[PDB]
Design an enzyme around this catalytic site. Structure first.
Site, PDB file in Angstrom:
ATOM      1  CD  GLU A  52      77.098   6.599 -14.381  1.00 44.75           C
ATOM      2  OE1 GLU A  52      76.932   7.170 -15.484  1.00 44.75           O
ATOM      3  OE2 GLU A  52      76.677   5.441 -14.139  1.00 44.75           O
ATOM      4  CB  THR A 220      65.628   5.453  -6.330  1.00 44.99           C
ATOM      5  OG1 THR A 220      64.198   5.435  -6.202  1.00 44.99           O
ATOM      6  CG2 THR A 220      66.111   4.006  -6.494  1.00 44.99           C
ATOM      7  CG  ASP A 224      76.605   1.991  -9.503  1.00 41.64           C
ATOM      8  OD1 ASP A 224      75.537   2.507  -9.087  1.00 41.64           O
ATOM      9  OD2 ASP A 224      76.948   2.013 -10.715  1.00 41.64           O
ATOM     10  CE1 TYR A 269      58.315  -3.419   0.160  1.00 38.82           C
ATOM     11  CE2 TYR A 269      58.758  -5.073  -1.519  1.00 38.82           C
ATOM     12  CZ  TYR A 269      58.263  -3.836  -1.156  1.00 38.82           C
ATOM     13  OH  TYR A 269      57.713  -3.004  -2.111  1.00 38.82           O
ATOM     14  CE1 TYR A 293      64.694  -0.790  -4.938  1.00 36.61           C
ATOM     15  CE2 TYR A 293      65.526  -1.625  -7.011  1.00 36.61           C
ATOM     16  CZ  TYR A 293      64.567  -1.622  -6.028  1.00 36.61           C
ATOM     17  OH  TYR A 293      63.463  -2.452  -6.143  1.00 36.61           O
ATOM     18  CE1 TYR A 387      78.074 -17.064   2.944  1.00 37.20           C
ATOM     19  CE2 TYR A 387      78.810 -16.498   0.736  1.00 37.20           C
ATOM     20  CZ  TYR A 387      79.095 -16.890   2.034  1.00 37.20           C
ATOM     21  OH  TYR A 387      80.400 -17.111   2.439  1.00 37.20           O
TER      22      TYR A 387
END
Ligand SMILES: OC[C@H]1O[C@@H](O[C@H]2[C@H](O)[C@@H](O)[C@@H](O)O[C@@H]2CO)[C@H](O)[C@@H](O)[C@@H]1O
Ligand SMILES: OC[C@H]1O[C@@H](O[C@H]2[C@H](O)[C@@H](O)[C@H](O)O[C@@H]2CO)[C@H](O)[C@@H](O)[C@@H]1O
Ligand SMILES: OC[C@H]1O[C@@H](O[C@H]2[C@H](O)[C@@H](O)[C@H](O)O[C@@H]2CO)[C@H](O)[C@@H](O)[C@@H]1O
Ligand SMILES: [Ca+2]
Ligand SMILES: [Ca+2]
Length: 630
Positions: A52, A220, A224, A269, A293, A387
């Site tokens: 960030e 990881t 954003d 997954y 993530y 969705y």
């Protein structure tokens, strides 16, 4: 180029941020999370930093290039990013990455409602879908390595995972143990676990359950942040075209990063979206949002690797500006053949997601998940969906709720506003109209004092209508502002959002739009004027904040019965641990006596912080107003 007081305010802030006395940057030229070290909130030490912060550094420098024509700072920001926060060869060994199997991306493990339920057992028989990106990325870039930022860096090796006499940066991670693991409840670990520190198996068996453990790496992403990097680089490129400067190789970095960022579109997954007990066969596991993530890891002592997405999605992470850049500009089309098409599909989905989550009042609600409980549990009857993903008021975390912070509103709607200004997509208009009315109604000005307050904490009730393709007004989804405060970084972001929103309305001839234009523009300007008038200090623009949560320095940390280990400095890790007991170097901090007194007579801790992102948001807001309204 504009020459007005707001442009000058940017330059003055920029000078403060870069002045060596003020301490924003490490020896490596890496921006710290904050100037101040005693700081816990997402990073748990002030001189950690985040992907960030790197993305905000890019953005700050892009604005400086826009206003001055000097691109040296922007190039520097990308150079330090690639050197220090995008894992390199020794960080993600190519032999492990090249032994990836896209038909078996990872091994399933459940997420759990409490840290005490970790380690979570690997279930080798559980379904895992296919990774449809890997082969395309490998073909395009001629490597299996991932070009994305890891989210957290120990800039000066404060934890000591880099050894007793190094201050070079170390990739570290904290959060591992699910929804109830707050920043006070983690056990920090090196991303490269060579089992030199921690317990018998390093830190690995705190988190995952297996019959044996090998040395390994794990990184990881914070999607954003990587999206903000794209947003920043587009702004730099607009400037480059204006000034006649070539930054094509830096554009190429951002587009490569955006290419790998497609992993943030996928279920953890690779399970089918809306049919999540089933393994996906490719893009049927694409959620098409920016998820919480993606992560990747593999062996150090032997050659193997894995990748996961995340089933969880928060509105606060979305970035339609980045998605538009990658899908609808020629300069930022990524090299992978399908990348622009994928990003175009994400752009549409993201804008729908904001609308779906917009409360009756106008604030945007949390998000949605493809994995109820993080273990693909059946959704309760009547679950409201997007969705096929179930509504979640607080994606991923509940201590505290991940949508309590008003900052997500400003950060994320700033991107919608900049996107609306850039594309004039009509699908964003009512969304912004409604959000801006709500935001402006909750800015409390004290005109006599030239000060203000904005929302600090939000409380949510209810649920949206299931998405059927158009906004419903969501009459049963509500936000209340529980507390107001003076978060000046968030105020800067809010100004930025309102500036782009107003500028986007400037071409409207509709009478109601003109009123909204005036209100948003004036509100933005007053925030900037009052920041400048009333909140300046030597290092930037800041104000005291009270941290009642610092009582959690003595927060109990779950450690499994019988598990023992040590931190690099020798701190003993065992049952009975606390946040502080495994971070005894905090007692060496110059701010510690104040904290310890406060804990002593039961008070919150008063601190004045200069967060790099916050100072950057403020500077960039000055520059934004100064460039849009000449
Ligand atoms: O996790 C979101 C961001 O949090 C920022 O810290 C916030 C914190 O979440 C709030 O509770 C409150 O204390 O204000 C802090 C500063 O705005 C953190 O600085 C960011 O890095 C995170 O992305
Ligand atoms: O240990 C070998 C085994 O690991 C699996 O990866 C795990 C990893 O061990 C764990 O530390 C991490 O947190 O999660 C991943 C999920 O896969 C891997 O999937 C196996 O192929 C590998 O043989
Ligand atoms: O708990 C899920 C997941 O969180 C990962 O850390 C996040 C963190 O929660 C967020 O605040 C920060 O901005 O981004 C990081 C990276 O996405 C953590 O690294 C994972 O191991 C964990 O599974
Ligand atoms: Ca360092
Ligand atoms: Ca907790």
């Amino acid at each position: 180029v504009p020459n007005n007081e707001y442009v000058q305010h940017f330059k003055d802030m920029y000078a403060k941020i870069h002045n060596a006395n003020n301490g924003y940057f490490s020896d490596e030229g890496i921006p710290y999370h904050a100037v101040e070290t005693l700081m816990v909130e997402a990073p748990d030490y002030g001189h950690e930093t985040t992907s960030e912060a790197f993305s905000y550094y890019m953005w700050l420098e892009a604005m400086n290039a826009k206003l001055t024509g000097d691109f040296s700072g922007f190039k520097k920001a990308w150079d330090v990013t690639e050197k220090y926060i995008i894992p390199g060869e020794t960080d993600q060994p190519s032999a492990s990455m090249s032994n990836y199997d896209p038909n078996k991306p990872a091994t399933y493990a459940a997420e759990h409602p409490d840290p005490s339920m970790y380690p979570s057992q690997l279930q080798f028989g559980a379904a895992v879908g296919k990774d449809p990106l890997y082969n395309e990325l490998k073909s395009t870039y001629g490597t299996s390595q991932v070009y994305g930022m890891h989210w957290l860096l120990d800039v000066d090796n404060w934890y000591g995972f880099g050894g007793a006499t190094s201050t070079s940066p170390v990739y570290i991670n904290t959060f591992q143990r699910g929804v109830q693991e707050s920043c006070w409840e983690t056990v920090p670990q090196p991303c490269k676990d060579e089992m030199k520190y921690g317990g018998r198996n390093g830190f690995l068996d705190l988190f995952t359950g297996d019959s044996q453990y090998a040395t390994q790496f794990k990184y990881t992403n914070a999607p954003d942040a990587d999206a903000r990097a794209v947003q920043a680089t587009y702004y730099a490129q607009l400037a480059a075209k204006e000034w006649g400067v070539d930054i094509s190789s830096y554009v190429a970095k951002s587009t490569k990063m955006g290419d790998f960022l497609r992993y943030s579109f996928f279920d953890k997954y690779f399970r089918k979206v809306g049919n999540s007990t089933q393994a996906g066969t490719g893009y049927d596991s694409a959620q098409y949002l920016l998820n919480w993530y993606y992560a990747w890891g593999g062996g150090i002592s032997s050659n193997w690797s894995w990748r996961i997405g995340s089933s969880h999605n928060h509105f606060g992470y979305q970035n339609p500006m980045a998605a538009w850049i990658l899908s609808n500009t020629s300069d930022f089309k990524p090299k992978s053949p399908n990348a622009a098409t994928d990003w175009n599909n994400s752009l549409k989905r993201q804008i729908e997601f904001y609308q779906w989550l917009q409360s009756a009042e106008g604030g945007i609600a949390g998000g949605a998940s493809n994995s109820n409980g993080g273990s693909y549990q059946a959704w309760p009857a009547g679950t409201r969906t997007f969705y096929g993903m179930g509504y979640t008021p607080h994606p991923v975390y509940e201590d505290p709720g991940s949508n309590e912070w008003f900052g997500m509103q400003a950060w994320s709607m700033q991107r919608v506003a900049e996107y609306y200004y850039s594309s004039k997509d009509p699908a964003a208009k009512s969304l912004l109209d409604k959000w801006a009315k709500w935001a402006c109604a909750n800015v409390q000005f004290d005109d006599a004092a030239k000060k203000f307050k904005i929302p600090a904490k939000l409380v949510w009730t209810g649920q949206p209508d299931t998405w059927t393709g158009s906004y419903t007004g969501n009459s049963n989804l509500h936000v209340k502002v529980e507390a107001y405060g003076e978060d000046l970084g968030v105020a800067g972001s809010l100004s930025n959002a309102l500036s782009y929103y107003a500028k986007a309305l400037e071409s409207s001839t509709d009478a109601a739009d003109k009123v909204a234009y005036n209100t948003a523009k004036e509100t933005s300007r007053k925030i900037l004027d009052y920041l400048w008038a009333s909140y300046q200090d030597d290092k930037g623009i800041a104000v005291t904040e009270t941290r009642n949560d610092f009582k959690r320095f003595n927060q109990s940390v779950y450690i499994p019965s019988g598990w023992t280990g040590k931190m690099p400095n020798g701190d003993v890790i065992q049952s009975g641990a606390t946040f502080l007991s495994i971070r005894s170097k905090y007692k060496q901090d110059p701010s510690w006596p104040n904290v310890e007194a406060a804990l002593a007579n039961g008070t919150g801790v008063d601190m004045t912080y200069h967060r790099f992102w916050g100072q950057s948001d403020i500077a960039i807001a000055f520059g934004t107003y100064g460039t849009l309204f000449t």
